Every structure is written in C-alpha cells, then in structure tokens.
Amino acid sequence: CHPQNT
Amino acid sequence: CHPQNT
Amino acid sequence: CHPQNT
Amino acid sequence: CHPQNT
Amino acid sequence: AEAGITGTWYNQLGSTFIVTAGADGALTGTYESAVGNAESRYVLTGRYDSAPATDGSGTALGWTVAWKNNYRNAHSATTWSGQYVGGAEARINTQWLLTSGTTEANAWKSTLVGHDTFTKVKP
Amino acid sequence: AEAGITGTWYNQLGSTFIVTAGADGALTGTYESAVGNAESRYVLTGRYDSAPATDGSGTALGWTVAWKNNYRNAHSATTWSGQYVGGAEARINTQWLLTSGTTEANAWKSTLVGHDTFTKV
Amino acid sequence: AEAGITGTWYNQLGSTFIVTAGADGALTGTYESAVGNAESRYVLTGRYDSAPATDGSGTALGWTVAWKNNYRNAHSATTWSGQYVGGAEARINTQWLLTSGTTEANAWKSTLVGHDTFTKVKP
Amino acid sequence: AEAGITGTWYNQLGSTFIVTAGADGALTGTYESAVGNAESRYVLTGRYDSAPATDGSGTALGWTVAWKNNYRNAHSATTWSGQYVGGAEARINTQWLLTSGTTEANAWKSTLVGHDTFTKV
C-alpha cells in the first residue's frame, strides 16, 4: 500500500 | 485550432 | 511477466 | 525557443 | 462484454465518439469535436479485452485517430489508453498522447499528454 | 518516407513488430515479445498520416495491442504514439501508455508510461 | 501571487498538501494521505512562476516528494507538474509521474502516470 | 550509488545539470541550456531516496525547474522523475512533464511529456 493515495 | 477538442 | 517485453 | 533545450 | 462498450459516448469538452466492439476484440468507429457537422469526423481503430476478469474490475481498451480526413490534415495522431467501467452510469476513463510530425530539431517537444472521461448516451 | 513503414522492426528489448501500412492510413500487423515462441504474438491495429508534410517532418502514427491471444490474457492494453523518420537509418520514435483493468480502488495506479525506439536491425 | 498558493489543499482521494510559496519562487511543505496521523507525512520541495502573465492565465508550478520519512521507505519518488488557477474556488490541476527504484531488467515498467485536482481549504 | 549523484551531468541535447545531493534527501543545483551563455541558468530543487535498497536497484529521484530567471520568464515549469544507476558508466534515466500557464480554453493542451538520459560525458 503506497502512501501517495489510499 | 486542433480538431481533437474545441 | 507482462507480454510486452521479454 | 523554450529554455529547456538548445 | 462488447455490447456495453458499443454506443455513442461524449467527453467533458463536448467531443463525440461512436464505436462498435466486435467479438474478436476489434474496435471501429468515428471521432468528432463539438462543432458537430460532417467534418470534424475522423476514423478510429482500436482493441479491447473481449474476456475481462469478473470482480468489479474494468475492461482495458485503447484506440488511435490520425487527424487527417478529406477536408483537413493536421499532421498528428492521438492514442487513448484506459478502461471501461460498466454499471448504472458506464464510463470510459482514459489518458491520451498526441504526437505531431516535427523536424528532428523540434522532436523533443512533439508530444502532448492529457486525460479524458466519456459518459454514454446511446447504444 | 510513407510506405517505408511496412516491414519488420525491433525495439531495444528485442520485441518484434511486423506492420503493413495501407495507402489510406491503416496500420495492421502483429507484435511479439523476445524468446519469440509462436504465441507471444498479439494482434495490433492503428493509423498514420498518409499525406505527410513536405518540409523535413517525420510521419505521425500510433497503434494499440490488447494483451489477449489464444493462450494468455493479461487484462491490459498498450497504445504507442510517435513518428516515423525515413533515411539511410530509418526509425520510429515512440512513447507508450499501458493500462491494466483494475477495481475502483486501484484506479489511480492503473497506467504505466514509457518510450521505445524501433529500428530495422 | 505567492499568497494564493500558500495554504492547505486536498485532492479527490483525500490526501493533504500543506505548502508555503516564498517570494524567490520556492515551494516547501508537507504531503500526507487520508489516513491522517503523523506519518504519512513526507517533505516536499518545488518551484513556481512568481511573476505570472496577467489575463485569466494560470501560474505554472511543480513539486517532488521522495517517499521516505522516519517510519517508512517505499523506494520511489513522485513529481506533480500543473497550474494554479485562482478565483472564487481556487484549484491546482496536475499530472504526476511516480518512479520506483528497479533492477535494470524491470526498468521498462518503473513509472506510473496519473492526474490530480486540489481544492483549497485554509491558508 | 547514493552520493555519486553529486556532479555535472549532460543530457543528449547538450543541456547541463549541476547538482548537490544532501545526506538526508535534498537535491539542489542549476540547469542551463546548450549555447551555455550565463543565463540560460535556472534554479532547480528536488528529492531522492537517501537509503536505497541493497539488491541491484537504482535510486529513485525527481526535481523541478520553473522557467523564470532575471532575464527571461517563459511561464512554464518542468518536473523530471526517474532513477540513478551507478557503475563504471553512471547515468540518470528520466521522463518529464512540461506544463505552461494557459487560459481555461487551452488547458487541455497545456502539458508536454518526454524522456532524457543524463551522463557525465
């Protein structure tokens, strides 16, 4: 889960 | 004026 | 593997 | 001319 | 499912896209801007995934238009790549790349990138 | 120039793209990955400018490949957009967009972007 | 005009962007996703045009975030490039590029592209 | 690897990019076009991963240049996103987005996309 988006 | 968009 | 390259 | 290249 | 893609679609700027999806994965149709009329019409050809994953996953597709018809020639081509999402309000979400024919010296600035959303209006 | 597009081209990773350019703007052919086993082949369709400018300009073109054939279905499609340049050393310079079919939640990370240069060697 | 850009902005997915525009063209601040909390916070640095054209023309700007802070390291960086449009409802419209560190063999698929719209909520 | 980023790099069109990489992730420096007359120079700022992965991975990085200095103002900004690869022949491989300030009507054609490879030669 990349922190840019949820 | 390109025909893709107005 | 994705078919696009190699 | 755009400053980015040449 | 080919039937859901087939129809008349429109994007946020008022351009018209008429497409038919064939059972072998082919896409064919015409593209037009908001001025309407006969020619602003250009031929389009593309491909889509005729056997998509189940889930609530979208169907991947893509199509190209070379901006030349029998009235004008802008010396450029656009490709849209995105996904069809069916449901109450079906939408095609895309990203596109517009490339113009340039001399070698201006080739570094030949391509524009952007994004389009199409809403369906008719089969 | 114009018809010089018809032929067999290779990108920098060994993928082969075989195309037929129609007098009025159609592009038709097959694309296959390196290794080259006979179904690693996929169908492609596209368009190109059939009447390019007479100054030293390249020829605008583009095509699509949906990544499904009789053996595999990768639930994705790639579009390449660029221009053809004829000469003693002909090439097709492109940038591409690879979209995958995703759920609504993963829509933001659905598309990859890249570039390829195709030559006849 | 630096004052209009400075503030707290949010995008359509619920991520937070806090920025200050300095008079020499510098942009500094922090970026956070919708989970909120302390760390989901990463440092951002960018530049904007401090002397824009008059008209109803937008102001061009861009900023970068490397996705590493003191709690996580995703080994990737994102750059957003777009324009600030002021008025009743000010908006920043952008396009972004996310690149991950990969080995040479997977470098052809290292970069994602997309687009974001930010709406302002506070100075 | 890591600090190897600090130095003077050149892209394929002769533009020079001089950068200082800070221990904690900052990137600072100047960019100047070919011809190289002393204001063709613009300020750049950015970030890079200061603790990269130990397998054979490249180092993720990115930076911005707003096209205004004391002499010219082109009402545009360029962001480059990519990765650094160290070796006997070091390079930084990137793709970039050039946005121009436009009116609402021309917003759809505001951004160009391209790619650049920077080397120390």
From Swiss-Prot, chains E, G:
Keywords: Biotin, Secreted, Signal. One of its GO terms (cellular component) is extracellular region. It is found in: Secreted. Residues 1-123 form the Avidin-like domain. It comes from the Bacteria. GO terms for molecular function: biotin binding. Its main location: secreted. A motif (Cell attachment site) lies at residues 47-49. Biotin binds at Y31, Y42, W80, W96, W108. The biological function of streptavidin is not known. Forms a strong non-covalent specific complex with biotin (one molecule of biotin per subunit of streptavidin). Belongs to the avidin/streptavidin family. Homotetramer. This is Streptavidin. It comes from Streptomyces avidinii.
Swiss-Prot record, chains F, H:
Biotin binds at Y31, Y42, W80, W96, W108. One of its GO terms (molecular function) is biotin binding. GO terms for cellular component: extracellular region. It is found in: Secreted. Keywords: Biotin, Secreted, Signal. A motif (Cell attachment site) lies at residues 47-49. Residues 1-121 form the Avidin-like domain. Belongs to the avidin/streptavidin family. Homotetramer. The biological function of streptavidin is not known. Forms a strong non-covalent specific complex with biotin (one molecule of biotin per subunit of streptavidin). This is Streptavidin. It comes from Streptomyces avidinii. The chain holds residues 37 to 157 of 183 of the full protein.
